[PDB]
Design an enzyme around this catalytic site. Structure first.
Site, short mmCIF file in Angstrom:
data_model
loop_
_atom_site.label_atom_id
_atom_site.label_comp_id
_atom_site.label_asym_id
_atom_site.label_seq_id
_atom_site.Cartn_x
_atom_site.Cartn_y
_atom_site.Cartn_z
NE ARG A 130 -3.64 -2.07 2.55
CZ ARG A 130 -3.38 -3.40 3.27
NH1 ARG A 130 -2.28 -3.65 3.98
NH2 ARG A 130 -4.31 -4.38 3.49
CE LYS A 167 -7.56 -0.68 4.83
NZ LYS A 167 -8.24 -0.87 3.49
NE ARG A 223 -3.37 -3.85 -1.35
CZ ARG A 223 -2.59 -4.81 -0.65
NH1 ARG A 223 -1.36 -4.66 -0.74
NH2 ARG A 223 -3.18 -5.41 0.42
CG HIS A 265 -5.51 -8.91 0.62
ND1 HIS A 265 -5.89 -7.77 -0.40
CD2 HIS A 265 -5.31 -9.98 0.00
CE1 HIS A 265 -5.66 -8.32 -1.59
NE2 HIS A 265 -5.71 -9.70 -1.28
CE1 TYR A 274 -6.60 -4.25 -3.74
CE2 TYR A 274 -7.90 -5.48 -2.14
CZ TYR A 274 -7.03 -4.49 -2.50
OH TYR A 274 -6.63 -3.62 -1.31
#
Ligand code: VO4
Length: 313
Positions: A130, A167, A223, A265, A274
């Site tokens: 990120r 995150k 990403r 993630h 995504y």
DNA sequence: GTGTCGCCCTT
DNA sequence: ATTCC
DNA sequence: CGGAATAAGGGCGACA
């Protein structure tokens, strides 16, 4: 649409709740279709019909930390999901340029901002990390790419390990071995003697935004791309490798799980937020598996890109 | 120019 | 975004 | 699997 202010089921044009809207204001229909969460304050509801709300911002409120939380209609969400197909093609089409920029700049001195930008883009297209806005570092101690410090970079004679808490307090470790493109310039960039200094000490948000601009994309698009690229590599490898083939369901599931673990993630968010929607549906088509059979990865990637192109419009 | 803020939007 | 259901 | 609930990220233009 006009922002109306919500208090105890009632709507007002002013934030002091002295000026009520008419009982037939269309936003009251909206309120028949959505729950205002009890944990939000200072709620704003847009004056529109439910049909209009479908594609738009519906309401906003402050959570317990004072952050403004935005709720959007289902078609807004669907339109958001549909963009990922396009983003996937766009990044694929601009990757050679990104690599040309990296290769041009990665030979410069480590204190040159262009060198640092080169290393930023290389780390990003390798690891999908990120952006790392300063604000969340200050607010939450969150680290991302731009907010990496020398402390996060651990140097061994064989390897470099990047480890940081990102995150949602999720811990991340990425390893750069000696044989990696990234190894030499990262070793060069890092300053062992300054653990508390930023790695990218000649960069800033503005400078990153200005540099990414030339490629027609945002950092988060790298990403989105990396997730899909990684899924596709894994899908190809899976189809090619596992002796008795899993069921369709089992295969997609395995591939997502593998992809999500590379990226860092959950499988759930990998697919929800995504994966390009056309990729997902084409991988359900039993006619597709045979095409995969005798492709190189790049041939395979190239067919997928073309199918996504002609299917986004 | 810089560092941050405020709004919007996303994961 | 993770967690829960 | 999908989706509700709520927390906390990124992008962009303006302010101090
Ligand atoms: O940022 V979402 O993984």
């Amino acid at each position: 649409m006009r922002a109306l202010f919500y208090k105890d089921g009632k709507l007002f044009t002013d934030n002091n709740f002295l000026n009520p809207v008419s009982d037939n204001n269309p936003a009251y229909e909206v309120l028949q279709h959505v729950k205002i969460p009890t944990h939000l304050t200072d709620v704003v509801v847009y004056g529109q019909t439910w049909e209009e709300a479908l594609t738009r911002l519906i309401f906003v409120g402050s959570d317990s930390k004072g952050r403004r939380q935005y709720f959007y209609g289902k078609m807004h969400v669907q339109n958001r999901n549909a963009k990922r197909d396009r983003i996937f093609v766009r990044v694929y089409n601009v990757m050679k340029r990104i690599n040309s920029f990296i290769n041009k700049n990665i030979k410069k001195s480590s204190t040159d901002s262009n060198y640092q930008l080169a290393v930023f883009m290389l780390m990003e297209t390798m690891f999908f990390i990120r952006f790392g806005k300063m604000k969340y570092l200050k607010e939450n101690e969150t680290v991302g790419l731009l907010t990496l410090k020398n402390k996060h970079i651990e140097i061994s004679p064989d390897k470099i390990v990047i480890k940081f808490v990102g995150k949602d307090k999720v811990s991340h470790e990425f390893v750069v071995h000696k044989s990696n493109r990234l190894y030499k310039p990262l070793l060069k960039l890092t300053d062992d003697s300054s653990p508390e200094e930023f790695l990218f000490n000649k960069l800033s948000e503005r400078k990153v935004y200005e540099s990414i601009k030339q490629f027609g994309i945002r950092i988060k698009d790298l990403r989105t791309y990396g997730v899909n690229y990684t899924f596709l590599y894994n899908f190809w490898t899976n189809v090619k490798s596992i002796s008795p083939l899993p069921s369709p369901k089992k295969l997609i599931a395995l591939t997502i799980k593998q992809t999500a673990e590379v990226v860092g993630h959950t499988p759930s968010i990998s697919k929800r937020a995504y994966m390009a929607t056309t990729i997902l549906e084409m991988v359900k088509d039993k006619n597709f598996l045979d095409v995969v059979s005798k492709t190189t990865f790049d041939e395979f990637l190239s067919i997928v890109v073309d199918h996504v192109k002609s299917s986004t419009d």
